[PDB]
Motif scaffolding. Structure first.
Motif, PDB file in Angstrom:
ATOM      1  N   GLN A  10       0.827  -1.201   0.000  1.00  0.00           N
ATOM      2  CA  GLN A  10       0.000   0.000   0.000  1.00  0.00           C
ATOM      3  C   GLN A  10       0.865   1.256   0.000  1.00  0.00           C
ATOM      4  OE1 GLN A  10      -1.961   0.244   4.095  1.00  0.00           O
ATOM      5  NE2 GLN A  10      -1.049  -1.807   4.151  1.00  0.00           N
ATOM      6  N   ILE A  11       1.938   1.230   0.785  1.00  0.00           N
ATOM      7  CA  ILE A  11       2.846   2.367   0.875  1.00  0.00           C
ATOM      8  C   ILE A  11       4.297   1.913   0.752  1.00  0.00           C
ATOM      9  CG2 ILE A  11       2.973   2.253   3.384  1.00  0.00           C
ATOM     10  CD1 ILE A  11       2.663   5.673   1.997  1.00  0.00           C
ATOM     11  N   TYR A  12       5.109   2.733   0.091  1.00  0.00           N
ATOM     12  CA  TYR A  12       6.508   2.400  -0.141  1.00  0.00           C
ATOM     13  C   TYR A  12       7.371   3.658  -0.165  1.00  0.00           C
ATOM     14  CZ  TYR A  12       3.000  -0.353  -2.602  1.00  0.00           C
ATOM     15  OH  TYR A  12       1.832  -0.990  -2.950  1.00  0.00           O
ATOM     16  N   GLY A  13       7.180   4.481  -1.192  1.00  0.00           N
ATOM     17  CA  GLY A  13       7.949   5.706  -1.311  1.00  0.00           C
ATOM     18  C   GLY A  13       8.016   6.217  -2.736  1.00  0.00           C
ATOM     19  N   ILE A  14       8.663   5.452  -3.609  1.00  0.00           N
ATOM     20  CA  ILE A  14       8.797   5.839  -5.008  1.00  0.00           C
ATOM     21  C   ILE A  14       7.430   6.027  -5.658  1.00  0.00           C
ATOM     22  CG2 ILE A  14       8.853   3.483  -5.918  1.00  0.00           C
ATOM     23  CD1 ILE A  14       8.820   5.376  -8.172  1.00  0.00           C
ATOM     24  N   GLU A  15       6.530   5.078  -5.425  1.00  0.00           N
ATOM     25  CA  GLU A  15       5.187   5.153  -5.985  1.00  0.00           C
ATOM     26  C   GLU A  15       4.377   6.228  -5.273  1.00  0.00           C
ATOM     27  OE1 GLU A  15       5.933   1.230  -7.182  1.00  0.00           O
ATOM     28  OE2 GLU A  15       3.811   0.777  -6.831  1.00  0.00           O
ATOM     29  N   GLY A  16       4.618   6.376  -3.975  1.00  0.00           N
ATOM     30  CA  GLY A  16       3.914   7.382  -3.205  1.00  0.00           C
ATOM     31  C   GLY A  16       4.405   8.779  -3.524  1.00  0.00           C
ATOM     32  N   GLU A  36      -6.785  14.598  -4.957  1.00  0.00           N
ATOM     33  CA  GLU A  36      -6.970  13.481  -4.037  1.00  0.00           C
ATOM     34  C   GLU A  36      -8.286  12.785  -4.331  1.00  0.00           C
ATOM     35  OE1 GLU A  36      -8.094  14.236  -0.104  1.00  0.00           O
ATOM     36  OE2 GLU A  36      -6.996  12.553   0.787  1.00  0.00           O
ATOM     37  N   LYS A  37      -9.291  13.579  -4.679  1.00  0.00           N
ATOM     38  CA  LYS A  37     -10.594  13.038  -5.013  1.00  0.00           C
ATOM     39  C   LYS A  37     -10.527  12.413  -6.391  1.00  0.00           C
ATOM     40  CE  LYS A  37     -13.536  14.777  -1.785  1.00  0.00           C
ATOM     41  NZ  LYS A  37     -14.686  13.992  -1.258  1.00  0.00           N
ATOM     42  N   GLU A  38      -9.728  13.017  -7.266  1.00  0.00           N
ATOM     43  CA  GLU A  38      -9.558  12.494  -8.599  1.00  0.00           C
ATOM     44  C   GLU A  38      -8.799  11.176  -8.535  1.00  0.00           C
ATOM     45  OE1 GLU A  38     -11.425  14.507  -8.493  1.00  0.00           O
ATOM     46  OE2 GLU A  38     -10.630  16.455  -9.125  1.00  0.00           O
ATOM     47  N   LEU A  39      -7.664  11.184  -7.841  1.00  0.00           N
ATOM     48  CA  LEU A  39      -6.849   9.983  -7.689  1.00  0.00           C
ATOM     49  C   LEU A  39      -7.710   8.793  -7.281  1.00  0.00           C
ATOM     50  CD1 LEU A  39      -3.369  10.805  -6.123  1.00  0.00           C
ATOM     51  CD2 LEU A  39      -3.925   9.696  -8.295  1.00  0.00           C
ATOM     52  N   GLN A  44     -10.925   3.128  -8.806  1.00  0.00           N
ATOM     53  CA  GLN A  44     -12.144   2.454  -9.232  1.00  0.00           C
ATOM     54  C   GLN A  44     -12.029   1.999 -10.683  1.00  0.00           C
ATOM     55  OE1 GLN A  44     -15.160   1.352  -7.235  1.00  0.00           O
ATOM     56  NE2 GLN A  44     -16.065   3.406  -7.332  1.00  0.00           N
ATOM     57  N   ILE A  45     -11.277   2.757 -11.476  1.00  0.00           N
ATOM     58  CA  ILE A  45     -11.080   2.432 -12.883  1.00  0.00           C
ATOM     59  C   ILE A  45     -10.317   1.121 -13.040  1.00  0.00           C
ATOM     60  CG2 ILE A  45     -10.112   3.203 -15.080  1.00  0.00           C
ATOM     61  CD1 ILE A  45     -10.188   6.099 -13.585  1.00  0.00           C
ATOM     62  N   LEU A  46      -9.425   0.837 -12.098  1.00  0.00           N
ATOM     63  CA  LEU A  46      -8.640  -0.389 -12.147  1.00  0.00           C
ATOM     64  C   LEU A  46      -9.476  -1.588 -11.711  1.00  0.00           C
ATOM     65  CD1 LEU A  46      -5.994   0.269 -13.288  1.00  0.00           C
ATOM     66  CD2 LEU A  46      -4.896  -0.193 -11.084  1.00  0.00           C
ATOM     67  N   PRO A  99      -3.280   2.015  -7.342  1.00  0.00           N
ATOM     68  CA  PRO A  99      -4.116   2.218  -6.154  1.00  0.00           C
ATOM     69  C   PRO A  99      -3.285   2.485  -4.904  1.00  0.00           C
ATOM     70  CG  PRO A  99      -4.922   0.354  -7.405  1.00  0.00           C
ATOM     71  CD  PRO A  99      -3.624   0.761  -8.043  1.00  0.00           C
ATOM     72  N   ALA A 100      -2.042   2.014  -4.915  1.00  0.00           N
ATOM     73  CA  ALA A 100      -1.142   2.207  -3.786  1.00  0.00           C
ATOM     74  C   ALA A 100      -0.625   3.640  -3.743  1.00  0.00           C
ATOM     75  CB  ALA A 100       0.017   1.225  -3.863  1.00  0.00           C
ATOM     76  N   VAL A 101      -0.525   4.263  -4.913  1.00  0.00           N
ATOM     77  CA  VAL A 101      -0.047   5.637  -5.011  1.00  0.00           C
ATOM     78  C   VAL A 101      -1.082   6.614  -4.465  1.00  0.00           C
ATOM     79  CG1 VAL A 101       0.936   7.388  -6.530  1.00  0.00           C
ATOM     80  CG2 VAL A 101       1.180   4.962  -7.101  1.00  0.00           C
ATOM     81  N   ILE A 102      -2.356   6.289  -4.660  1.00  0.00           N
ATOM     82  CA  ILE A 102      -3.443   7.137  -4.186  1.00  0.00           C
ATOM     83  C   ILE A 102      -3.496   7.158  -2.662  1.00  0.00           C
ATOM     84  CG2 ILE A 102      -5.912   7.619  -4.312  1.00  0.00           C
ATOM     85  CD1 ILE A 102      -5.538   5.359  -6.792  1.00  0.00           C
TER      86      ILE A 102
END
Length: 120
Positions: A10-16, A36-39, A44-46, A99-102
Motif C-alpha cells: 500500500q505504501i513504499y515511497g517511489i510510488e507514493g 486526491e478526489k480524482e486519484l 475504481q477504474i482499475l 491504487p497504492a499511489v493514491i
C-alpha cells in the motif's frame, strides 16, 4: 498446496512520491481536493473489469491510448491536477499497482496542512 503468504502492499515511497511530486504543485494551489478526489477515480477504474481490458491493452498504442484517457479525464473528475498524472500513470504502464499511489496521497495530503505558515 498454493499456500503463499501474499505480503502487504500500500505504501513504499517511489510510488507514493509520484502523487506527492504531482500534487506538490497542487498543494501550492490547494487542489489536493481535485487531485486526491480524482486519484480516487483511478482506483475504481482499475477495479473495473472492462477497464482492465483498456488500461492495459497493448493493442492501442503508446500515444493513442493516452488520447482515450482524456475521455476518462474530462468525464470522471480529472482535468486539472489529474490531467497530467493521467498520462503519466499510463505513460510507462503503472496502471496495475497505482491504487497504492493514491493511498500515499491521503497521508501526504495531511502533511501539507501543517507545512504552512500558520500565523493567522
Amino acid at each position: 498446496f498454493a499456500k503463499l503468504v501474499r505480503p502487504p502492499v500500500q505504501i513504499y515511497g517511489i510510488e507514493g512520491r509520484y502523487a506527492t511530486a504531482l500534487y506538490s504543485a497542487a498543494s501550492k494551489q490547494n487542489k489536493l481536493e481535485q487531485v486526491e478526489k480524482e486519484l480516487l477515480r483511478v482506483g475504481q477504474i482499475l477495479k473495473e473489469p472492462k477497464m482492465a481490458a483498456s488500461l492495459l491493452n497493448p493493442y492501442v498504442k503508446r500515444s493513442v491510448k493516452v488520447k482515450s484517457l482524456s475521455d476518462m479525464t474530462a468525464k470522471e473528475k480529472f482535468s486539472p491536477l489529474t490531467s497530467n498524472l493521467i498520462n503519466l500513470l499510463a505513460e510507462n504502464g503503472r496502471l496495475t499497482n497505482t491504487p497504492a499511489v493514491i493511498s500515499a496521497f491521503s497521508t501526504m495530503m495531511s502533511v501539507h496542512r501543517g507545512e504552512v505558515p500558520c500565523t493567522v
